[PDB]
Amino acid sequence: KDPRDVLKRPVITERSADLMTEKKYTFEVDVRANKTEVKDAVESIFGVKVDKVNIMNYKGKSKRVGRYTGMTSRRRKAIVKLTADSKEIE
Amino acid sequence: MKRTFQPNNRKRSKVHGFRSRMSSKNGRLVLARRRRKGRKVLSA
Amino acid sequence: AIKKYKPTSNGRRGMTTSDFAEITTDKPEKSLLAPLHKKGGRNNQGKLTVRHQGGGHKRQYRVIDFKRDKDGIPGRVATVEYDPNRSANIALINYADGEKRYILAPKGIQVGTEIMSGPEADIKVGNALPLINIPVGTVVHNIELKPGKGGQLVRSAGTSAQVLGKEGKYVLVRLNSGEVRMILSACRASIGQVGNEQHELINIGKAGRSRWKGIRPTVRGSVMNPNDHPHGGGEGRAPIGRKSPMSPWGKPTLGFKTRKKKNKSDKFIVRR
RNA sequence: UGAGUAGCGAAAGAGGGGUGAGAAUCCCCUCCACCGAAUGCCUAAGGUUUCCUGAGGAAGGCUCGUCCGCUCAGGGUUAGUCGGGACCUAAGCCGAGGCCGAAAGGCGUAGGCGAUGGACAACAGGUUGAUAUUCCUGUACCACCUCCUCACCAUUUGAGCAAUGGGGGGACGCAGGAGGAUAGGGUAAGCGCGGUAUUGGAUAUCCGCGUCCAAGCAGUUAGGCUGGGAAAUAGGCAAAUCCGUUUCCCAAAGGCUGAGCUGUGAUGGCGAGCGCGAAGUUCCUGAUUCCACACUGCCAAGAAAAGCCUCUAGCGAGGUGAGAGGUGCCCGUACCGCAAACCGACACAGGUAGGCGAGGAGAGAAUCCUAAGGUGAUCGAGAGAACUCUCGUUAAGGAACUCGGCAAAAUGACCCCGUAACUUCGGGAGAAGGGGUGCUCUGUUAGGGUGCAAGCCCGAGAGAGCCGCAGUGAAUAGGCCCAGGCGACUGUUUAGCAAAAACACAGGUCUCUGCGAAGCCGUAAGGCGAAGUAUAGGGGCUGACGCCUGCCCGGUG
RNA sequence: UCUACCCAUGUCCAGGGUGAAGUUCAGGUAACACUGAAUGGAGGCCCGAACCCACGCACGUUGAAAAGUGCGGGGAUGAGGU
């Protein structure tokens, strides 16, 4: 399990932009990953000390276009609080 | 009017579940003929 | 030890109970309890095979020593206890070595007396001997058939049997109901009379009390329907027009013997 | 077609502004009205995005709709401590070997699964539109780990560790009544802030509002439960210092538990009120909650296992204690949850397990009006005919209608007084049926509780007087009596026509069964009967209690 | 998953009456019976909310509802409801 595949994408929202100021970041991570290797991955790949990680996952929202009634993909969101005096991220 | 149906996911799965069907002999035929018919929702 | 409730409500109109002076304690010894969940007349596959049963007050089993195997160790008895499994009452007797045991409390037993169980024990109330040592014409209880199996034959409240004589490998003993039997001479019985002699005279007043004891209602065959009992049916209250009265499953049920006539034990029963 | 007819699904809105093409229906404001042991506040099963923001109004909405539980685009659920997992077991299920069976398979030992139970460490303030014991703030606690620190023991006459093995515990029922304490309430006194009015009067014992704070840490306690020591050891599969059983000696100490109360936790927060922020005490009342199944009584005699303590068997050269520094995973977490999101085909007068559930009068969670809080209920307005339905009064008579007092009317609360025939002596009995009930003074009545007092609260009585036709001035809480069949009684039944004289019943009787009981399910293994033993189980019949239960065995069994 | 029965384990029942059995006191007796108070708190006990049931009437009967609503009723510490 390479760390680079654990973190899929970030999320850009009003609340994400909020948490950026107080040094809490948001990441879409692998569904199977747990609270530990996400921490280890962010540490390894950004070289930044981290304080705490909180994980929460959404169900797949149902949607309808035209005549078809599929289901959106499931999501597992991650919140990472970085320690004080640490480097930021792009 | 406590009507004839009362939903309970635990019991629904425990009786009509795929495990419960696969366990017994007759459930295997039930799944077999459902698959033969080609039903989408194979088991409860 | 039988008292009457003065009729205050209508339920207690006819009522008797047994005050528990014969009992000496209320809390049992934790060690000898065992779990017991009431089956309620249901077989292993779940079907019902015993009518008129189920739904009593929950009870905990106390393992009784029916074998009396431990021989020669002087036993002291200090309790008489209530036990809701069988009519009789039991006694927790503690031995010299230091392990305790339960025993059917016999009539005339009191806290503090001694107990012996060897094949040379003195003959008093509470002692147990192999029948060969027992002398003729002495009341006895808690008899068994196969030696070492433990007493089976006289165990309910106030029940007793009398030894009518020894004649060889077996012995002649008069069980309750008087049907004298031939029994092996190497079996161990308990001398005396079972000590709850007044249990018969109870007058259960309420239906609810029988239900507490765990006896379901019994419906007559007559008021059934034709398909569900050989008596059911008929307009009005009908007499049973089926020659012999019959059981729910077809057999007659008045005055005819039922024990498979070829069985081996019969040759010992027939002493009579 | 019926036909622009029935229906538009219990209910109070009124008005002024706003938006808008269009407004009874959407938004804001002011009154008014409804629930308030709920129509309130949390939380299950369950629903699965319906939750929030911004847009739209074809369809859904029994009307309209600019509106939303509809459509479209975005957004939203953060846990070492909450619930469930890596902890335990009940019923039941599965089941290696096996037992049985034409085949499939049935049964079941070892063993495992299985909460609705047991054990188990975080709480009170803040915060946005959606989350919050999860995010932030201050204080904590739990399990484990050591690059580290100090205090100590011995590195075999071994320090330390402790078992998937014993033993103790966990460990249990129902009802009743004391006591102790606390939620909670009263605003009684005091305190702080604001106000003194225009309708006749009120700087006055005048009006409105508020009047507190954990978990943890250290003490203390109402209390409850406990006797303690010494020697021995036919037992607890092996051990024994543990447990148990004996014998000798002292008799209150010591021990375990303990709601709560004290300080700190609080130099902080919250706090009426215009980002700041006053006072923040005492008194009175007081539990459906806790001490606590603690005590008493009763019989119907009231789970298991692991967590935990302890005993050795055993391991043992490095460990113990405390600091300091760290680690702590998975799933749930949005929203409705007495409702328009659940179950009833519906935005349906139905049903939906738990916790909290205030004030005035009161015994009360009843009754009526109200608090926090929520709601005005999805078709309207205007005529005020019949007829139908739900209600309110009716002169005189009063059950004359009627199959039948069906329905309706009448009594109803509390305190005094008297209560019959019969009776199984309990009952019958709230029998019947009479009297009083308001308000003021004598009174901060005797007297009682509370407290050192001050004060607060409870209030038997009488004696004077004052009112109205009417004093439990409303809401709501027995109609009664005499006889008789049937059934002793409480209870149960034809969900969805029939709740009864039918069923059951305790009691009685007959009969079967000597225990691999009989009887019953199954073919059989297996069971129930029963870890029960003729004072017990099965079956037939009758049905409290009192007096009794006659003759016939020719026939059928 | 409705319903009948049963097993395991939890949970609910505002408030007020009656007053059993025993027990203490006093008398009573040689002693025992017994008599009167006090205490006591039992009942498939009584009245009555939640809860459950469904006896009467009316309405409804192409209903709000494929069995209900409104006003009265029965049980309400038990064979209880859930």
Numbering used by the authors:
A (entry chain s): 2 to 91
B (entry chain 2): 1 to 44
C (entry chain Z): 2 to 273
Q: What do the study's own words say?
A:
In B. subtilis, the related protein MutS2 was recently implicated in ribosome rescue. Using a combination of in vivo and in vitro approaches, we show that MutS2 uses its ABC ATPase activity to split ribosomes, targeting the nascent peptide for degradation through the ribosome quality control pathway.
We observe two major classes of collided disomes: one with only mRNA density in the interribosomal space and another with an additional density next to the mRNA (B and EV3). By local refinement of the experimental data and rigid body-fitting of a model of MutS2 generated in Alphafold2, we identified these extra densities as the SMR and KOW domains, respectively. On the stalled ribosome, the SMR domain interacts with uS11 and uS7, as does SmrB; on the collided ribosome, the SMR domain is positioned next to uS3. The KOW domain on the stalled ribosome is part of the second MutS2 in the homodimer whose other domains are not resolved. Here, only in disomes where both ribosomes adopt a non-rotated (or classical) conformation do we find density corresponding to the SMR domain, despite the presence of collided disomes in other states in our dataset. In contrast, in the Cerullo structure, the collided ribosome appears in a rotated (or hybrid) conformation. In addition, there are differences in the ribosome proteins present at the disome interface: bS21 is missing in the stalled ribosome in our structure where it was previously observed, and uS2 is clearly present on both the stalled and collided ribosomes in our structure, although it was previously missing from the stalled ribosome.
